[PDB]
Design a protein around this nucleic acid. Structure first.
Ligand SMILES: [Mg+2]
Length: 713
DNA sequence: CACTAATAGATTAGAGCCGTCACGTATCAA
DNA sequence: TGACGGCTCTAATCT
DNA sequence: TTGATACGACTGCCGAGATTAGATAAAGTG
């Protein structure tokens, strides 16, 4: 099969002539910063259809006004207002993307909506679900800001709004339009409750990416809200777009579905070794946690099966060493953090974060997650991660590569990985270029060199690689640019650049909406209509004995209930009759109903299917986005190996594969190796790692240097 | 008994967060 | 100092 | 006779109106 994935990039073509015929456009220059008040007064006076913000590095405008009927253009000092034509829209650097922004700004969150005029430059969507109150009854919504950037990528960033009682003439004031379910700018004092951007409370606000619990829950997520808005826009503004707004479709090239290992198989490296559990002296709170953890580890079957000796001493011994300390990083206190010596491997854990101690408790309350067939305390994710970090620190200190299996190490040896860190607190722009090389004996060969961006004419390998990365980066002046780049994998003269981006993977939201509509619980059904439909669909079943038997049982079950019923009644009747969706026969019936019937008891979303709408969120693959004409930009994604849970909190970002040196075949020949390195368990607990695993070694090695060189911290 | 007065945005850049490290159950291979 | 990694507020940059 | 691999993880209801007698109970001045 061929998997299809769609990113945040949009495909659309605005029907320019119809838009020009139905509207008049105005461009507002703002020269004087004090003239913002006059501009706000003008906006309060007028009533435009939509407003977007033209702003570029070569400024020829500051706002675009979409007017159904152009008003009398006035003359105000500090503003230049002049009606333009869409054929001359290139004169003010108005690309065919602020027009889609206007049409987006006219939209609404509600299903089956129309083009309602609006004056807010940005589309901020918030309902009643994304709302909470404080002890001062400060209403604090948080919306979902939608915006199409200069490269036609949709951004869905979360915007949080707080409540203010009185109008602020110097700050921006926002008012919640409850009917349209979206925030709006307030230019004049208005009845209602005012809002301002910001979130100063302790807890953050996260909007779920997508949820498959049901259609109602799906509509209150990033993907669901985006789908609602896109479908609305594709419907009400049918004339204005020659082609509908759809996310750009792309083909996966190198799909990798390597299964991970059980997280608790890391104790094999610890076989026939010792763990010296000890804590910070004269601190009872850490001592009891250390004692409890040591006792759990001793009694654990996995520890006792692998022949691992766990002892609770009072000081650091040779070999592995887990330390328990009070976190004194923030305020002033004695530093219980002990730095490891020559042959000692230390891995500290605090009490506040690891032991889950909030300020006030008299004693520890840490309880390892022992869920499973037989309860075992050496299987918790935190303990496994501690052991994995101990194994990695052992590799770093010993200089040998021994925690990566023996077959993956052979495939990784002939490749060299560079690491970059923009050296802050340096007058001259300087970057530290680390380089990890592997000897044929699987030995680490870290070797760095400080490189100045001004003096890039040197001919060493570090200077060459830094110069090549320097050219590719958009804004090398800042440090976030150098933070975006992960590593530069090198194979001889070939060099490949891995860089993080902001474009994420979007699932096929339309198909998810269509299926969840079929599986909608409160969907009323007609007994006669459903019976007739199932009778007509009977010939198409043609499966095995149990499948057809379950289909006939469901067909005969429908007649039992009342002439009309919600789908929940049918679902409960099937469940009581023994049609558990987990069964093999009922699953095929559910799939058949999803593909062909107007209803389905269970939806085949979490199932692994040849063409799933959840493509790109589950496996590792490589994509080739056009990004214009002939550049053939290459990207890849990393998804969760396990089956997706009903909710997915975070999207999956797209890294970039830019060949600094060599031809285009560098990607096609090195990507399988990178994917093989990315299928590891120690770097990321229970998941794939987005970047190759030697990036973890480089990051740990650089942190070790930072521990001794405050000049680079 | 008393107020008047009369008020940068927009867009990135980064520190630091949470939150996810999957679990109990039917089910085909070996 | 479980740690990775997306990403959210917020100080910074930029007129 | 058990060690895999693919998928389940279920939230309720949804106002108006009309009739009584019932110790109490502080601390003020423009
Ligand atoms: Mg660490």
């Amino acid at each position: 099969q061929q998997s299809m994935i769609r990113t945040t990039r949009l495909d659309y073509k605005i029907n320019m002539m119809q838009l020009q015929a139905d509207f008049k456009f105005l461009v507002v220059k703002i020269i004087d910063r004090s003239a913002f008040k006059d501009y706000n007064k003008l906006l309060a006076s007028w009533s435009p259809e939509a407003v977007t913000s033209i702003r570029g590095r070569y400024k020829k405008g500051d706002y675009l006004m979409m007017f159904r009927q152009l008003p009398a253009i006035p003359t105000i000092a500090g503003l230049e207002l002049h009606e333009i034509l869409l054929e001359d829209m290139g004169e003010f650097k108005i690309y065919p993307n602020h027009l889609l922004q206007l049409l987006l700004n006219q939209q609404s969150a509600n299903e089956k909506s129309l083009l309602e005029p609006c004056k807010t430059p940005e589309l901020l969507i918030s309902g009643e679900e994304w709302y909470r109150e404080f002890r001062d009854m400060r209403q604090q919504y948080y919306a979902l800001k939608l915006k199409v950037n200069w490269q036609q990528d949709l951004e869905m960033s979360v915007q949080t709004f707080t409540q203010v009682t009185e109008f602020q003439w110097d700050k921006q004031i926002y008012q919640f339009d409850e009917k349209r379910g979206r925030f709006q700018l307030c230019y004049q004092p208005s009845p209602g409750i005012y809002f301002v951007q910001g979130n100063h409370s302790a807890n953050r606000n996260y909007i779920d990416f997508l949820s498959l619990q049901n259609k109602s829950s799906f509509y209150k997520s990033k993907v669901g809200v985006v789908q609602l808005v896109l479908d609305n826009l594709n419907l009400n503004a049918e004339k204005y777009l020659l082609r509908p707004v759809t996310f750009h479709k792309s083909l996966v090239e190198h799909s990798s579905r390597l299964k991970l290992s059980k997280r608790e198989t890391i104790w094999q490296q610890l076989a026939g070794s010792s763990l010296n559990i000890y804590a910070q002296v004269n601190d009872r709170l850490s001592q009891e946690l250390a004692d409890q953890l040591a006792d759990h580890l001793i009694r654990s079957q996995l520890v006792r099966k692998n022949s691992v000796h766990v002892v609770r001493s009072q000081k650091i011994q040779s070999g592995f060493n887990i330390q328990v300390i009070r976190d004194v990083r923030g305020r002033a206190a004695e530093d219980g953090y002990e730095v490891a010596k020559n042959d000692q491997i230390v891995q500290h854990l605090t009490v506040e974060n690891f032991g889950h101690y909030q300020e006030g408790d008299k004693e520890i309350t840490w309880k390892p997650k022992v869920s499973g067939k037989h309860h075992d305390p050496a299987r918790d994710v935190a303990i496994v991660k501690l052991i994995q970090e101990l194994c990695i620190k052992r590799d770093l200190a010993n200089g040998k590569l021994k925690t990566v299996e023996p077959k993956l190490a052979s495939l990784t040896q002939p490749l060299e990985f560079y690491y970059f860190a923009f050296l802050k607190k340096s007058f001259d722009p300087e970057v530290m270029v680390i380089k990890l090389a592997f000897t044929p004996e699987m030995e680490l060969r870290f070797s760095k060199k400080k490189v100045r961006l001004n003096a890039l004419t040197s001919d060493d390998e570090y200077t060459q690689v830094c110069k090549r990365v320097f050219d590719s980066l958009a804004a090398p002046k800042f440090y976030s640019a150098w933070d975006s780049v992960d590593c530069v994998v090198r194979s001889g003269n070939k060099q490949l650049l891995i860089q993080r981006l902001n474009r994420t993977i979007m699932p096929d939201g339309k198909q998810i909406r269509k299926q969840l509509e079929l599986n909608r619980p409160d969907k009323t059904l007609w007994r006669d209509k459903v019976v007739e439909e199932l009778g007509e669909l009977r010939p198409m079943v043609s499966g095995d004995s149990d499948y057809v038997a379950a289909y006939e049982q469901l067909q005969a079950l429908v007649t039992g209930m009342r002439p009309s019923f919600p789908l929940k009644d049918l679902d409960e009747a099937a469940r009581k009759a023994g049609l558990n969706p987990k069964r093999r026969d009922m699953r095929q019936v559910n799939q058949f109903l999803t593909e062909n019937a107007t209803f389905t008891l269970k939806t085949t979303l979490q199932r692994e299917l040849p063409d799933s709408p959840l493509a790109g969120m589950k496996w590792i693959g490589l994509t080739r986005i056009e990004e214009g004409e002939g550049h053939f930009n290459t990207f890849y994604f990393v998804g969760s190996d396990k089956s997706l849970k009903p909710v997915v909190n975070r999207a999956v970002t797209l890294r970039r594969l830019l060949p600094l040196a060599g031809d285009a075949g560098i990607i096609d020949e090195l990507f399988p190796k990178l994917a093989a390195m990315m299928s590891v368990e120690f770097v990321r607990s229970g998941q794939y790692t987005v970047v190759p695993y030697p990036v973890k070694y480089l990051r740990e090695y650089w942190y070790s240097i930072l521990r001794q060189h405050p000049e680079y911290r």
